Design a protein around this ligand. Sequence first.
Ligand SMILES: [Fe+3]
Ligand SMILES: [Fe+3]
Ligand SMILES: [Fe+3]
Ligand SMILES: [Fe+3]
Ligand SMILES: [Fe+3]
Ligand SMILES: [Fe+3]
Lengths: 172, 172, 172, 172, 172, 172
Amino acid sequence: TSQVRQNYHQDSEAAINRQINLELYASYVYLSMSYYFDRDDVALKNFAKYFLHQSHEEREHAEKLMKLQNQRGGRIFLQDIKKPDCDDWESGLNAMECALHLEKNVNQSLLELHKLATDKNDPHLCDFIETHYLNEQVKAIKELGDHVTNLRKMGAPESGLAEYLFDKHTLG
Amino acid sequence: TSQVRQNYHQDSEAAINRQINLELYASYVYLSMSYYFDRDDVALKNFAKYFLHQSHEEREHAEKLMKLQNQRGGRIFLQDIKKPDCDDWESGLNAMECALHLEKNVNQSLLELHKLATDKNDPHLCDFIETHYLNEQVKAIKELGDHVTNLRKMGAPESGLAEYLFDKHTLG
Amino acid sequence: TSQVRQNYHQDSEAAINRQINLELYASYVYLSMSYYFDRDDVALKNFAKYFLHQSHEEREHAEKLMKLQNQRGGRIFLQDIKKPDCDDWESGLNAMECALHLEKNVNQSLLELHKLATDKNDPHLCDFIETHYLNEQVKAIKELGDHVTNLRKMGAPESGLAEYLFDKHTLG
Amino acid sequence: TSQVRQNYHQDSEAAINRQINLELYASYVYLSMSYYFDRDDVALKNFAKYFLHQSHEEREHAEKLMKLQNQRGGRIFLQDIKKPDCDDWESGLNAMECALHLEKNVNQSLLELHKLATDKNDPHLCDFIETHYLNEQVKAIKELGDHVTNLRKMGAPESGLAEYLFDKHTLG
Amino acid sequence: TSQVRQNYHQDSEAAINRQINLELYASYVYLSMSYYFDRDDVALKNFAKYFLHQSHEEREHAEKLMKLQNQRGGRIFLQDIKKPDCDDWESGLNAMECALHLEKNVNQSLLELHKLATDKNDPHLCDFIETHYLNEQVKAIKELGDHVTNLRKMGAPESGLAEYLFDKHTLG
Amino acid sequence: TSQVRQNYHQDSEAAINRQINLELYASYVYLSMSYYFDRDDVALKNFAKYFLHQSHEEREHAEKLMKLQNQRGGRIFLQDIKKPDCDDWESGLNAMECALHLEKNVNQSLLELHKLATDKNDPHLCDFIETHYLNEQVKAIKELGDHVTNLRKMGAPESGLAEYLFDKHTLG
Ligand SMILES: [Fe+3]
Ligand SMILES: [Fe+3]
Ligand SMILES: [Fe+3]
Ligand SMILES: [Fe+3]
Ligand SMILES: [Fe+3]
Ligand SMILES: [Fe+3]
């Protein structure tokens, strides 16, 4: 046992280890997306910048979870990061839609984790997810929904003018 | 009676009290409009900013009227602010059209008030409405008519590209 | 349903809509109070400034709640803002006492809302009320209790010297 | 009763009063430790600086708890601060080990207090302990565990070179 | 024996250890006083600030005595800090009166200590109490007597206006 | 085929895709290493900082390779990032030794890739590996060999003083 461990269930430690894997996978998906819009046949530079910064943020999220593990006396066990479930992302609209789907998946995993903490009487873990994850996620979900709405309104995916214009004004 | 009251008819005091209620209602309508364009299914950020600043201005208008009441020795009596007559505002064009309709309603109430002052020999009240309200209103009406014209020209409400583009260049 | 809605009960959405109405009413009460102390027969300038800034803060509180509604995929439904339950507020002490009463009413509505979130497993809403409302309210209640205590000590409401002196040193 | 009291159980008030006593005792223990390493026969200047700043922090923690008591309408009742349970602290390693033991004791008292708040439906108190105490404590526990690990690795307590070197590089 | 001990009687060492306990108790009394005037039913903010800074000063006095002990080769032995002899301090005037009483108690303990040094031929200890304690105490006693005089003159404790006014102009 | 593809063999494209996977794996190994030295039972803060920055660099290396793929008209295909082959890294010396082993593995993969380019007449790819990878790798290998030499000289892994001292002076 760790000399610093206090009120840290094995279930929580394990759930944290799984959260790290999911955040790392999310970063990989966004790195796939960013470079999709770097192709000469896509060329949406701002779409690429968006998913690159999202990828970096997800990595920061994983590194914060790993730090918490170490601070709670839990032991970080790492697993394989699976390949993004897609390689060709089609339009910018489909990529935003995929991103929303993945963010709502993380938020749920995070909510399930907050429930575990609430069920194991882990007030510190609760505050941590509330303080550093929950609202961030609600904020990403809303940004993506709005991106998706505007893209659909401007006529994307069929209007390439829209995706290009969306790139210059919003993502730009 | 107030020790500072001089040439202030009861009719004017009452008309001022009613003007305050209308300005407060106008602020509420614009607050409804601003948050309509904050929805994930609308996402017109600049439309939201426009109606938010309009809401703030209408509140300033009410507070100036309340100050005048106190300065003229009139007693401010407040009434219930009714709920904006709409909750779903549809397109950005419909919201601008509603805003014009409400501004022309305030200007008329203001003109009727200027008539009361002119009929009660209240030169101070007259200058006040002339100095702080009338032209402001003519200026809002013209800005809204132009917004409405450009939106209709660009193809709004049916062209979402137009509303989005209108948001980025004019409201933006 | 909203594309961004996740773990957001109808009860919570409705409770948020009601919280917005109460915050808007609180702003109206403080606007009534501010202009009460702008009368020539009252003339407590700092009392007026206090309740004006409180009014503005309550409006900011409502606008933050409306933003949260939009971010959680809830739909903002607005209701009529009732007239402040008083028009003549008597002394500065009575106004502070009314303000305390209304703040403890909001805090309770907020606490009841935090309970609903805790009962619907809404950790995000919980943090939101904890992060942006609860302590703020405890802080307002304490400022008002202290204002009320000092006013009663200095001899207010019967000592006009006290209310005037309280205005210059504390509110001033 | 206090005019500002709302949702504040007697149990919580009492638990807060006891938390204040423990934080004050912790400050006394750290003041004993700081001056232990100021002796001519010890002379670990940085060890002294560490426990002095820790002592000051614990005092700030008590003063924040006393402020919360006053803000919640609870009445601060103070008890005797017991003498630190030790006078000679031996090596720097033993002092760090004592400090860890005492920090894990405070964190537990804090966790028990968070449970009381969670059991009395005190969301404000909950956030307060989460916001200002819990993570701070997890952070102190981890800093001390690491200090203890490095000291044991470098060969302390038997190697005076280690304690001296630890003083110059880490505490220094 | 300490390698640095020279002309340091056991009586002096013990008297220094007792002086430390009294200074620590004085700090506790002032911390009780400071938070008394932070209550919603008292609300004398400047009275609170006064006794808080006094509390901090008394702690500095104890820490200087502990440093001297270490420098003279004496060994610091710590005892329990008793609870302030009061919990409710009534008026600001009574608190000042209590503070004077406690300061004259410390000065006497300090004078008795200076006598011990003069009787044991400890010129260094003599200068230390003369240099860092005696005049400071005479200066605190005079500030408190003057505070007490002005409070009694302005009509305190019965005039709450006085205590409030005293807070804004002198303590303020 | 891509409209920008010219002198880009399928073998090279595939070798680039494999290089990306290896660089991503290297980043994962360094992230495992960094957090190993963040444990309370390890606590080598500078060792953690070293492997964290190395992890970031390897990610930059992968992202540069992905950019080159897009610029040469090759299509990025991503595969699963395997879990670092170790979870407990033992001493700081073993971690450096592992890092050397992995860097010499990447350099070889890079050299094999430079051979493929030289064999397919791809002068651009050749310069790219020469310009951005080869020397960097020779420079990392030498830094790690030197780190390993100094650690072994100072007595690590058995001397914890050495690892701690190595952390403060070199990594520090
Ligand atoms: Fe994330
Ligand atoms: Fe207006
Ligand atoms: Fe509010
Ligand atoms: Fe503490
Ligand atoms: Fe003193
Ligand atoms: Fe690399």
